[PDB]
UniProtKB/Swiss-Prot annotation:
The gene is APOB. Induction: Up-regulated in response to enterovirus 71 (EV71) infection (at protein level). The chain holds residues 3124 to 3603 of 4563 of the full protein. This is Apolipoprotein B-100. Disulfide bonds join 71-74. It comes from Homo sapiens (Human). Residues 133-266 are annotated as: Heparin-binding. Glycans are attached at residues 86, 108, 161, 215. It comes from the Eukaryota. Interacts with PCSK9. Interacts with MTTP. Interacts with AUP1. Interacts with CIDEB. Coiled coil: none annotated. Palmitoylated; structural requirement for proper assembly of the hydrophobic core of the lipoprotein particle.
């Protein structure tokens, strides 16, 4: 309260100088500097409470380990599953402007159940948020885990979902994460999907999607795009197929001049006891300010069979134009050229330049 007192200071002339400082009227530092308004208080009262108790349980669950598999003390050895009690830890602090209360609870009777709760409250918008987290793992019939996380923040929206389940015969993995940024100038959204599954033959899905929204008004540069990928993987016993393709997409403008970029690729590989093949196609198509365009066809193709061999490597085409001066052009590139090999026959044709 003393600091809230609006002290009046008279006009004084400092010794050894001709300076006469101005008087101060109703100088309530706690209020005239905005602290009274900012913190909503005329003083400081702080309460901190921390709890870290633990009801100790030193017992364990001893699961006999079946060494009989090797025998064909086949059954005298113990897999230890602790009988620990709950671990409790609550943190709570109090104040006028900020209030934090986070509770973490962990259960360890025989399985694992972990839950977290963080509560933040403040006069400031960003300082107020909610975070929740639950992780559950069961071991009675193998390890089956399910983790889900959610964040409640003004600028970040985090949703994360991981669940690894073992049904005592089959293997399931799935990752479903979705989170987006809320930055004004650069708004972003990404999304993760990964579902590796193995009933008899493993099957894996890989789709990565990303979006980005950019605009720099001060720099007068703006661009939008998305880079997204899809991978298909099939490790079948009969044969093994791997398929991958990606698309680097973006459009933008800089100082009233357009920025163009779009990259697409298709990667394809095939394997088998008799024949294997792999052909990957590329399009580097892009240009800056509508200049130097047509980055095209950097593709290749190859095939190998027990009977024969074939190859086609770097057929391409290019044409890039300058939009300054007298519009000089150059797009040099190779023409298609191949190779085929068979018994008794050797054929090699090459066209280039």
């Amino acid at each position: 309260d003393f600091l809230n007192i609006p002290l009046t200071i008279p006009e004084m002339r400092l010794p050894y100088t001709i300076i006469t400082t101005p008087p101060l009227k109703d100088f309530s530092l706690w209020e005239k500097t905005g602290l009274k308004e900012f913190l909503k208080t005329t003083k400081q009262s702080f309460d901190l409470s921390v709890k870290a108790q633990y009801k100790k349980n030193k017992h364990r669950h001893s699961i006999t380990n079946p060494l009989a598999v090797l025998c064909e003390l086949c059954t005298i050895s113990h897999i230890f599953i602790p009988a620990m009690g709950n671990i409790t830890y609550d943190f709570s602090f109090k104040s006028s402007v900020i209030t934090l209360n986070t509770n973490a609870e962990l259960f360890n009777q025989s399985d694992i159940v972990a839950h977290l709760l963080s509560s933040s409250s403040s006069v400031i918008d960003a300082l107020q948020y909610k975070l929740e987290g639950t992780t559950r793992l069961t071991r009675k019939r193998g390890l089956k885990l399910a983790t889900a996380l959610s964040l409640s923040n003004k600028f970040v929206e985090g949703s994360h979902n991981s669940t690894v389940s073992l049904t005592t015969k089959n293997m399931e993995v799935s990752v479903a994460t979705t989170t987006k940024a809320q930055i004004p100038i650069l708004r972003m959204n990404f999304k993760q999907e990964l579902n590796g599954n193995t009933k008899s033959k493993p099957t894996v899905s890989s789709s990565m999607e990303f979006k980005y929204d950019f605009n720099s008004s001060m720099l007068y540069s703006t661009a939008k795009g998305a880079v997204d990928h899809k991978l298909s993987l099939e490790s079948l016993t009969s044969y093994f197929s791997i398929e991958s393709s990606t698309k680097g997409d973006v459009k933008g403008s800089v100082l009233s001049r357009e920025y163009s970029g779009t990259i697409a690729s298709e990667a394809n590989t095939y394997l088998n006891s008799k024949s294997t093949r792999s052909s990957v196609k590329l399009q580097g198509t892009s240009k800056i300010d509508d200049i130097w365009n047509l980055e095209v066809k950097e593709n290749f193709a190859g095939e190998a069979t027990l009977q024969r061999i074939y190859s086609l490597w770097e057929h391409s085409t290019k044409n890039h134009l300058q939009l300054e001066g007298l519009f000089f052009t150059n797009g040099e590139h190779t023409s298609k050229a191949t190779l085929e090999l068979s018994p008794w026959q050797m054929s090699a044709l090459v066209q280039v330049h």
